[PDB]
């Protein structure tokens, strides 16, 4: 007999998604208004002296107006755009952030400087510390080719590396290094061997260079240094001549004829493991899908949870208005920034401190059905706007119900067994940013717990192994390859509003203590106690997870209690990857990523403290648009709207198990938000996905209660994934 | 079209399972020899002055003889039994451990004192610190009834608690408290309200008592104290008379008429959540099972892994000869002990320091098919012997292939996407020990990684909430109920033999450092470095996981390297629950659990250091059979057979989310064993469970390579679990 089929369920969201990305039509109206207001050049025709548009996206509503709309029948918040435009028509070039609205475009619409969420109080980012945009990238690539493809340098490179200039690629370290004291902007660079399989990061040559790129006039840019085997040369001629001498040491060259060790996919001449000719297990939905959605509003419901999603170019997916059993628990949950900070003996990796939101986390590729997500997943389309084009991205994120490999709870005793299954709602997106693949998962449980996790995979940014200097910074993982040591750190804005906005943050500290008890006078016991301590003010040092896990961190309602007098609370519980940066004082990130130095921070919510980083931060080393430390000014948190900024990380020291790629299983970080006296009891008990087995002692009869779930054998069709929907590329573009 | 069916595959183990439990026939021969050698009384007729048999099990082979058999065509090790017999026929009673073999019983068979694995050098455990066996339990229960069911005490109890003696149960704290200085043995106790649903732990009355139980003559045992509202009474009469006075404070009584808050299973009058009338997702095997086994030898193979299992009464499942790609990586992996140590204002919980192996972890209940394990699982039968009966336990552990909710790795770039699925082999057993349910999972991955995890659920051991004294030890979670604060700590013996037995233990320490580089003279950089440090000797302090995760712990081959010169290694990587005891100096566990004070210990392998605890430890407070600290005697680990003793734990402070039961999702601990330069590369690349997608730039054609896996739609029957195989109880017994 066939399993009972059910159709996918669609619902109407309670409210409008006021956080959603701009519609194509809204972007068009904004772009038109900009073109009519300013002299805007198309990006394909633009240079450092043109004006052109970079970005146009939603300027999300402020919280109080949002909550008045959601909870108190207020007006829709004004619909506005944030745009970033490069202005090069003046004596000095700069990027400027501008607000355009309200939308749709009407007689009330204005264009104004936008700076309220920048701690530095500026709408304008100077050229010298500007975004590494398509224009600046093209100029740098042209400048490098001009210098490295001369007759002499062609010879220097081939002689040192072993392949001609055509067979390598030269490129610059990020961030650039602007010195506000001198006005100079310099950058380092290296070369990697070209590959057919995107494995250039595994073949670094150990040839380095340094250049000055100060000012908008590229005719004045100059190569400063060539660096090779830890020696500095101040001209091509000096290096060429050094190489002709008999005392010159040339480091071992990459074996470019044998690069099969860089290849990810299966070698079809490899033997197959026993039984690997049988397909691996599959998750199926015997009675159809158990989550619902509003397609227009990107609102989701599952087992008494509800939330809206939003998408941005900088960060990818965000969540708003997360409710459980009819009560908002989180106003905003949003990934803010991802960094990768390397330590090295060499001037390329030692100067690498990536800000992934500068590149964009939300402007990448589709998910591969069946593999990136289970075949039971639903897929959603999002969009972004960059450089004159609207990008529609299908299969951008997925939603699926998992069956976890362990039950949610159980007990056996007194002639019964009671077990509850553990289905979870899962939202995933994957962001492949060059070499790295980041896999983001949000997992919701039946009791009101949410787990936020990240895993990493892809190609490592390796380094040339120099036996004299490389050992303190990495392991030798191939003939001339070091697995360069680096930190990954990610920041999440977790705007918990537990039993309303007015909250307190507390910790239950656990300690061993010597006590005497009234029932055994004179006898000292070494025992353990808890002590509740309130986080009364913003702490500049942040909060690091306690030694030996001897504490619990809570966000409590300031006024609401459960039936036993306990403040309603949620526990922020670290899972794996509760680490922060090792390095304290980076020349490549002095003030640009100051949230990354502790496990977590608690601040008073402000609309002006929207975000802990920006896409414009990375090259603004000393005066970034957002300096996170500006948020930390000793404000009372004692009965206030608190935001937690929670970090996840990994200290990655690649070894053989990272070649050809890093694996997701061991590169993992997570935290949980779990109810703590939030209810009077554990709130999964109403699920039907449980069994109650009883045995009668006298009659020797067993009884099985399955609460309406029929476990009888039935037939299902195991459906083919929507593979046809997957095409390579970073979105379908429309100029 | 129907999915291609395949039958379950059975294989022949490479060798005999020399670690397997005794056959019924072996146990019978041993029991017969004991009965012919000594005057043995049946346990149902026995007292403190009889002799009777407690336990008969396999005395596992010593390592060198085992390895000679497995690897060098040696003889089968001798087949021996360990038995424990209580001898009460002498002037003083004691338990004695005895070796019986070789088996089968022949003219060569002897019975000898067995003590080699006891650090205290004794085969005999004195009565005073004896096992809490069926005989001693019965005597204590009889003694308590004699004292608490008198006319006066019946009145005292009803008056204080609110229900008659028939409606409560009184019982003693574990461990007992023997004082070797005085020879006295005392114990504390309390009463809980009787329930129909095994929820007595949620209804503690706050009535306590203390008794002296010194010696085998129960006529000399005496009640010492009654303790109530933090006052001590030295007779029933004193307390009765105190209660008649007008100044007497009676603490608030349990509302025994309203205990629905203790009930686990669904209330069928509760509303159903949206779409919870659809069955939750199911894992299926479209082309059948992909692991194989030898049923007689309990040998398992899956995707180039192999191992044997063994079962014991004390600990449940153990693993031996774990190999991956034809090489042993772990000789022995075995759970050793589980403790639960409470802190409290009251004399019951403050004296509770459970040793779960004393009760037995491997003598519990069957798994519930479909709920405890996926319906695709295979189930295995094990056995134990206790008190004259052989117990056959069906559905004792399960083996299943999961599909993890994330892929093992991926990369997108250069017009391809390459993704590998993440199937894992999973071995589970669940041990419900009274109130607690422990869920043990061993998860094997395609690359050679193994994850060991535990989750906990069940009823908490709560405490009576006294507003004057309870607050430092727990939260008030119901009207008169405290969620008593406790540590769970579990010890695993992890006998890694990485590239042979001769190994080294090392750590890569991570630190920030200020350096100057040859390519930028005079410029100080704050960067980060690694430093390899060898653990040259056994450290009495053990090893605690590093602050901010700034280190990697390795077990390395002493001589074998990979192709790049790195020692072949495995990384012991902490996951969640990397915590140890808070309390340092317990009166209830002075010397009995000394492994629990750090995250992990490294020792030189010895057959005499078989196990870090014993079932006989818990009441032997100062001179236990095994004092783990005896293992730690500063021996060189520099090119030696190393064993790692790895702890997992939880500091549990129950809140509302633990009523009516604790949930498995948030009560979790794990560690991973992962290859680290063990191969030249990451070793999952040969799996067929992957996709290679390519896109041609010119022809606009996509190609999908699925390596023999057909994702076409097909029909399967979703099978009913083997529910008929599940019967309540702790094994089918045979006298
Ligand atoms: C959301 O909240 C933020 C923070 O409260 C609001 O920021 C404010 O934006 C206005 C413009 O709409 C800024 O006013 C301007 O100030 C400059 C500086 O003197 C002045 O030259 C202009 O004439 C104008 O008055 C204001 O400074 C800024 N406030 C802060 C604290 O930075 C924002 O308006 C809110 N958005 C919405 C949709 O209501
Ligand atoms: C596995 O290895 C252990 C540890 O090496 C062996 O333990 C040894 O067991 C023997 C008995 O078989 C003990 O010998 C006895 O010693 C006592 C004490 O003086 C003596 O009275 C007896 O006459 C007898 O000689 C021996 O002490 C003990 N060794 C240690 C270090 O404690 C065990 O025999 C091995 N098992 C197998 C199956 O080979
Ligand atoms: C717009 O800018 C370009 C330079 O990019 C300039 O040549 C042109 O004259 C400007 N248009 C107007 C109307 O001033
Ligand atoms: C580099 O120089 C060679 C000739 O010296 C030329 O053929 C080639 O096109 C140049 N490459 C680029 C990208 O300019
Ligand atoms: C495939 O396997 C063969 C045989 O081991 C090996 O020589 C070759 O390097 C492999 N090819 C690739 C591209 O991985
Ligand atoms: C984006 O793609 C979706 C799905 O194909 C489609 O509904 C929508 O019209 C697209 N948007 C635009 C403006 O191309
Ligand atoms: C065996 O022990 C019992 C006491 O438990 C005793 O009465 C009996 O006589 C003993 N048997 C022999 C043969 O001595
Ligand atoms: C307790 O005492 C009462 C009479 O006082 C009696 O009826 C009952 O059987 C006793 N219970 C036990 C278990 O001895
Ligand atoms: C079932 O639900 C009803 C209505 O809320 C409640 O009164 C009762 O306590 C519940 N019964 C049990 C046994 O949980
Ligand atoms: C234990 O149970 C298994 C499975 O039912 C059976 O094969 C075996 O004979 C049983 N052992 C004994 C001795 O009862
Ligand atoms: Ca908040
Ligand atoms: Ca502040
Ligand atoms: Ca070993
Ligand atoms: Ca030792
Ligand atoms: Cl400005
Ligand atoms: Cl110019
Ligand atoms: Cl090479
Ligand atoms: Cl879909
Ligand atoms: Cl407190
Ligand atoms: Cl700056
Ligand atoms: Cl002895
Ligand atoms: Cl007696
Ligand atoms: Cl009550
Ligand atoms: Cl089975
Ligand atoms: Cl080192
Ligand atoms: Cl003792
Ligand atoms: Cu990394
Ligand atoms: Cu617990
Ligand atoms: Mg609508
Ligand atoms: Mg839209
Ligand atoms: Mg109006
Ligand atoms: Mg056989
Ligand atoms: Mg057997
Ligand atoms: Mg022989
Ligand atoms: Xe657009
Ligand atoms: Xe140069
Ligand atoms: Xe997946
Ligand atoms: Xe949440
Ligand atoms: Xe990460
Ligand atoms: Xe904490
Ligand atoms: Xe991370
Ligand atoms: Xe990560
Ligand atoms: Xe037996
Ligand atoms: Xe007493
Ligand atoms: Xe499960
Ligand atoms: Xe392993
Ligand atoms: Xe646990
Ligand atoms: Xe470590
Ligand atoms: Xe644990
Ligand atoms: Xe646990």
- The full length of chain B comes to 735
- Phi, psi (deg, nearest 5) at residue A529: -135, 160
Q: How far apart are alpha carbons A313 and B555 in whole angstroms?
A: 44
State the DSSP string of A653-720: ---GGGSS-B-TTTSEEEEEEEEESSSSS-TTTT-S-EEEEEE-TTT--EEEE-TT---S-EEEEEPP
Q: Which of B550, B557, B619 is nearest to B589 (CA)?
A: B619
**Chain A positions in Cβ-Cβ contact with residue B374 (cut-off 8 Å):** 403, 405
Token pair 């989550």: residue: A291
Q: How far apart are alpha carbons A369 and A723 in whole angstroms?
A: 6
- Per CATH, B1-15+248-735 and B133-247 having the same topology is answered no
State the DSSP string of B697-720: TTT--EEEE-TT---S-EEEEEPP
The residues, ordered by sequence, that sit 6+ positions from A184 with a Cβ below 8 Å of its Cβ are A178, A212, A214
Q: Take atom 1 of ligand 43 and give the residue whose Cα is closest.
A: B28
Nearest CA in chain A to B3: A718
Instruction: Give the torsion through C-alpha atoms of B511, B512, B515, B517, to 10 deg.
Output: 90
Is residue B601 helix, strand or coil?
Answer: strand
Where residue B549 falls (left for φ over 0; alpha for ψ -120 to 50; beta otherwise) is: left
CB A562 within 8 A of CB A556: no
Q: B104-142 burial string, b = 16+ CB within 10 Å, else e? A: ebeeebebeebbbbbbeebbebbbbbbbbbebbeebbee
- The full length of chain A comes to 735
DSSP state of B252: P
Token pair 């910074």: residue: A473
Which of B421, B485, B695 shows the shortest C-beta gap to A530?
Answer: B485
CB B202 within 8 A of CB A681: no
CB A494 within 8 A of CB A513: no
In chain B, count of helices (H) and strands (E)? 6, 40
Q: Which of A328, A295, A333, A296 is nearest to A317 (CA)?
A: A333
What is the resolution of the experimental data for this entry, in Å? 1.7
Cα(A535) to centroid(ligand 11), Å: 14
For residue B57, the distance in angstroms to the closest alpha carbon of chain A comes to 27
Tokens of A2: 């066939």
CB B675 within 8 A of CB B684: no
**Chain B positions in Cβ-Cβ contact with residue A282 (cut-off 8 Å):** 283-286, 403
Longest dimension (CA), chain A: 100
Is residue B516 helix, strand or coil?
Answer: strand
Cα–Cα distances in angstroms (integers) from residue B672 to residues A235, A415, B404, B440, in the given order: 51, 36, 16, 14
Pocket of ligand 3, candidates A34, A35, A37, A39: which has the most ligand atoms within 8 Å of its Cβ, to mutate?
A39
Q: How far apart are alpha carbons A496 and A151 in whole angstroms?
A: 62
Tokens of A197: 């399989």
CA angle (B541 as vertex; B539, B547 as ends), nearest 5: 110
Q: What is the CA radius of gyration of chain B?
A: 29
State the DSSP string of A609-670: ---S--TT-TT-SSS-S--GGGG-S--B-TTEEEEEEEEEEEEE---GGGSS-B-TTTSEEE
Chain centroid to CA A242: 46
Q: Which CATH class is domain A1-15+248-735?
A: mainly beta
With a 6 Å cutoff on the Cβ, whether A542 touches ligand 40 is no
CB A307 within 8 A of CB A70: no
- The residues of B assigned a catalytic role are 356, 436
Tokens of A340: 């990768």
Tokens of B488: 């769970």
A99 CA: nearest ligand 1 atom: 12
Question: Residue B426 and residue A447: Cβ atoms within 8 Å?
Answer: no
Q: How far apart are alpha carbons B408 and B419 in whole angstroms?
A: 8
DSSP state of B521: T
State the DSSP string of A474-518: EEEEETTEEEEEEEEEEEEEEEE-TTSSEEEEEEEEEEEEEEE-T
Q: How far apart are alpha carbons B672 and B457 in whole angstroms?
A: 22
Q: Take atom 11 of ligand 10 and give the residue whose Cα is closest.
A: B392
Q: How far apart are alpha carbons B691 and A279 in whole angstroms?
A: 12
Q: Which of B136, B61, B124 is nearest to B320 (CA)?
A: B61
Q: Take atom 5 of ligand 3 and give the residue whose Cα is closest.
A: A50
Question: Residue B283 and residue A285: Cβ atoms within 8 Å?
Answer: no
- Phi, psi (deg, nearest 5) at residue B211: -140, 155
Neighbours of A39 (CB within 10 A): 10
Token pair 């909250």: residue: A503
Longest dimension (CA), chain B: 100
A383 CA: nearest ligand 6 atom: 1
Tokens of B638: 């520099």
Determine which helix (DSSP H) or strand (DSSP E) holds B80, and give its type and residue range: strand B80-87
Token pair 């409470």: residue: B342
Q: Which of A709, A670, A659 is nearest to A261 (CA)?
A: A659
- What residues are paired with B601 via a beta bridge? B645
- The residue ranges of DSSP E strands in B194-253, in sequence order, are 204-212, 222-228, 231-233
With a 6 Å cutoff on the Cβ, whether A338 touches ligand 41 is no
The residues, ordered by sequence, that sit 6+ positions from A107 with a Cβ below 8 Å of its Cβ are none
Question: Residue A685 and residue B660: Cβ atoms within 8 Å?
Answer: yes
CB A411 within 8 A of CB B458: yes
Q: How far apart are alpha carbons A380 and A362 in whole angstroms?
A: 13
What own/partner pairs with CB < 8 Å and gap ≥ 24 does B558-561 have? B558/B500, B558/B502, B558/B503, B558/B504, B558/B639, B558/B640, B559/B499, B559/B500, B559/B502, B560/B499, B560/B500, B561/B677
Q: Which of A266, A271, A467 to mutate to test the interface with B (most CBs of B within 10 A)?
A: A266
Neighbours of A698 (CB within 10 A): 5
Q: Which residues are near ligand 50 (CB < 6 Å)?
A: B 454-456, 488, 577, 650, 667-669
Among 2.102.10.10, 3.10.450.40, 1.10.260.40, 3.40.640.10, name the CATH number for the domain at B133-247: 3.10.450.40
Question: Residue B280 and residue A449: Cβ atoms within 8 Å?
Answer: no
Cα(A114) to centroid(ligand 1), Å: 8
Question: Residue A526 and residue B583: Cβ atoms within 8 Å?
Answer: yes
The residues, ordered by sequence, that sit 6+ positions from A359 with a Cβ below 8 Å of its Cβ are A433, A434
For residue B32, the distance in angstroms to the closest alpha carbon of chain A comes to 33
Q: How far apart are alpha carbons B69 and B61 in whole angstroms?
A: 10
DSSP state of B216: S
The residues, ordered by sequence, that sit 6+ positions from B333 with a Cβ below 8 Å of its Cβ are B318, B319, B320, B322, B442, B452, B492, B493, B494, B495
Q: How far apart are alpha carbons B621 and A142 in whole angstroms?
A: 78
Question: Residue A409 and residue B661: Cβ atoms within 8 Å?
Answer: yes
**Chain B positions in Cβ-Cβ contact with residue A585 (cut-off 8 Å):** 526
DSSP state of B526: E
Q: Which of B184, B242, B489, B225 is nearest to B347 (CA)?
A: B225
Nearest CA in chain B to A291: B275
Which of B287, B511, B716 shows the shortest C-beta gap to A278?
Answer: B287
Before A86, cis peptide (omega within 30)? no
Q: Take atom 1 of ligand 4 and give the residue whose Cα is closest.
A: A149
Where exactly are the structural domains of chain B?
Answer: 1-15+248-735, 16-132, 133-247
Is residue B178 helix, strand or coil?
Answer: strand
Architecture of domain A16-132: Roll (3.10)
Q: How far apart are alpha carbons B541 and A394 in whole angstroms?
A: 56
The number of C-beta contacts closer than 8 angstroms across A and B is 591
For residue A693, the distance in angstroms to the closest alpha carbon of chain B comes to 9
The residues, ordered by sequence, that sit 6+ positions from A698 with a Cβ below 8 Å of its Cβ are none
- The residues of A assigned a catalytic role are 356, 436
Specify the pairing of strand A94-101 against strand A124-126: antiparallel
- What residues are paired with B645 via a beta bridge? B493, B601
Token pair 């022809």: residue: B699
- Return residues with CB closer than 5 A to ligand 22 (ion): B 217
CB B200 within 8 A of CB B359: no
Determine which helix (DSSP H) or strand (DSSP E) holds A168, and give its type and residue range: strand A168-172
First to last CA, chain A: 53
Q: Give me the helix-helix angle, B151-161 and B236-244, nearest 10°.
A: 50
Nearest ligand by distance to the CA of B370: 45
Cα(A136) to centroid(ligand 16), Å: 14
For residue A579, the distance in angstroms to the closest alpha carbon of chain B comes to 5
The residues, ordered by sequence, that sit 6+ positions from A420 with a Cβ below 8 Å of its Cβ are A407, A408, A409, A410, A446, A684, A687, A689, A690
Cα(B136) to centroid(ligand 2), Å: 31
CB B283 within 8 A of CB B424: no
Q: How far apart are alpha carbons A536 and A540 in whole angstroms?
A: 13
The residues, ordered by sequence, that sit 6+ positions from A257 with a Cβ below 8 Å of its Cβ are none
Which of B280, B684, B721 shows the shortest C-beta gap to A423?
Answer: B280
For residue A359, the distance in angstroms to the closest alpha carbon of chain B comes to 16
DSSP state of A98: E
Is residue A144 helix, strand or coil?
Answer: helix
Q: How far apart are alpha carbons A151 and A183 in whole angstroms?
A: 32
Specify the pairing of strand B327-343 against strand B481-496: antiparallel
- Phi, psi (deg, nearest 5) at residue B632: -100, 90
With a 6 Å cutoff on the Cβ, whether B381 touches ligand 10 is yes
Where residue A321 falls (left for φ over 0; alpha for ψ -120 to 50; beta otherwise) is: left
Q: How far apart are alpha carbons A519 and B234 in whole angstroms?
A: 12
**Chain A positions in Cβ-Cβ contact with residue B1 (cut-off 8 Å):** none
- Phi, psi (deg, nearest 5) at residue A154: -60, -40
Specify the pairing of strand B474-478 against strand B463-464: unpaired
Determine which helix (DSSP H) or strand (DSSP E) holds A69, and give its type and residue range: helix A63-71
Cα dihedral across residues B208, B210, B216, B218: positive or negative: negative
Token pair 């630190």: residue: B511
Neighbours of A184 (CB within 10 A): 14
Nearest ligand by distance to the CA of B407: 37
Tokens of B226: 């009654």
Is residue A208 helix, strand or coil?
Answer: strand
CB A563 within 8 A of CB A538: no
């Amino acid at each position: 007999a066939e399993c009972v089929s059910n159709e996918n369920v669609e619902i109407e969201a309670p409210k409008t998604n006021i956080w959603t990305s701009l519609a194509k039509e809204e972007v068009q109206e904004v772009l038109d208004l900009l073109h009519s207001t300013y002299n805007i050049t198309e990006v394909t025709k633009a240079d450092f002296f043109s004006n052109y548009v970079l970005w146009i996206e939603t300027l999300k509503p402020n919280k109080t107006e949002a909550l008045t709309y959601l909870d108190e029948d207020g007006d829709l918040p004004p619909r506005n755009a944030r745009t970033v435009v490069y202005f090069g028509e003046g004596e000095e070039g700069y990027f400027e952030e501008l607000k355009v609205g309200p939308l749709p475009v009407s007689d009330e619409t204005t264009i104004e400087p936008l700076s309220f969420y920048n701690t530095n109080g500026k709408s304008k980012l100077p050229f010298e510390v500007g975004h590494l945009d398509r224009i600046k990238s093209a100029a740098k690539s042209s400048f490098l080719n001009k210098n490295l493809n001369t007759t002499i340098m062609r010879d220097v490179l081939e002689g040192l590396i072993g392949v001609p200039y055509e067979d390598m690629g030269c490129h610059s370290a990020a961030p650039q290094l602007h010195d506000p004291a001198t006005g100079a902007t310099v950058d380092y660079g290296t070369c990697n061997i070209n590959t057919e399989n995107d494995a250039e990061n595994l073949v670094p040559t150990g040839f380095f260079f340094k250049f000055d790129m100060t000012g908008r006039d590229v005719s004045q840019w100059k190569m400063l240094e060539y660096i090779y085997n830890n020696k500095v040369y101040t001209s091509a001629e000096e290096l060429y001549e050094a190489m002709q001498k008999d005392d010159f040491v040339t480091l071992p060259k990459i074996d470019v004829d044998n690069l099969d060790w860089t290849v990810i996919q299966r070698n079809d001449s490899a033997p197959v493991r026993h039984l690997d000719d049988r397909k691996s297990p599959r998750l199926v939905e015997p009675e159809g899908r158990r989550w619902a959605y509003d397609g227009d509003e990107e609102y989701f419901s599952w087992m008494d949870w509800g939330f809206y999603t939003s998408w941005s170019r900088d960060t990818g997916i965000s969540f708003y208005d997360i409710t459980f059993k009819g009560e908002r628990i989180v106003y905003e949950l949003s990934l803010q920034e991802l960094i990768a900070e390397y330590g090295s003996d060499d001037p390329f990796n030692q100067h690498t401190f990536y800000s992934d939101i500068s590149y964009g986390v939300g402007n990448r590729f589709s998910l591969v059905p069946g593999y990136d997500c289970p075949s039971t997943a639903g897929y959603f389309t999002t969009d972004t706007f960059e450089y004159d084009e609207f990008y529609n991205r299908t299969l951008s994120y997925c939603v699926f119900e998992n069956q976890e490999d362990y039950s949610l709870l159980r007990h056996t005793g007194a002639s019964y067994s009671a077990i509850t299954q553990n289905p979870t709602l899962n939202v995933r997106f994957i962001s492949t940013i060059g070499n790295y693949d980041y896999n983001f998962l949000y997992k919701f449980f039946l009791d009101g717990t949410l787990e936020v996790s990240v895993r990493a995979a892809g190609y490592i940014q390796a380094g040339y192994w120099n036996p004299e200097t490389s050992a303190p910074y990495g392991l030798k993982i191939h003939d001339v390859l070091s697995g360069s040591f680096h930190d990954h750190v990610l920041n999440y804005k977790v705007d918990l509003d537990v039993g309303g906005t007015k909250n307190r943050a507390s910790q239950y500290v656990m300690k061993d203590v010597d006590v005497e008890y009234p029932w055994a006078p004179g006898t000292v016991y070494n025992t353990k106690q808890i002590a509740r301590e309130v986080f009364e003010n913003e702490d500049f040092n942040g909060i690091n997870w306690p030694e030996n896990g001897q504490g619990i961190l809570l966000i409590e309602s300031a006024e609401e209690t459960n039936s036993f007098g306990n403040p309603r609370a949620y526990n922020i519980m670290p899972g794996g990857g509760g680490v922060h940066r090792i390095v304290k004082n980076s020349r490549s990130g002095p003030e640009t990523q100051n949230w990354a130095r502790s496990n977590l921070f608690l601040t008073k919510h402000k609309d002006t403290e929207l975000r802990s980083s920006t896409a414009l931060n990375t090259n603004a080393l000393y005066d970034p648009p957002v300096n996170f430390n500006a948020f930390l000014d000793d404000e009372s948190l004692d009965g206030e709207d608190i935001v937690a900024w929670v970090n996840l990380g990994l200290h990655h020291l690649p070894n053989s198990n990272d070649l050809p790629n890093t694996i997701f299983s061991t590169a993992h970080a997570s935290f949980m938000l779990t109810p703590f006296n939030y209810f009077d009891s554990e709130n999964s008990r109403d699920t039907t996905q449980q069994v109650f087995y009883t045995y009668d002692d006298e009659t020797e009869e067993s009884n099985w209660e399955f609460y309406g779930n029929d476990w009888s054998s039935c037939g299902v069709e195991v459906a083919e994934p929507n593979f046809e929907d997957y095409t390579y590329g970073r979105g379908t573009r429309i100029n």
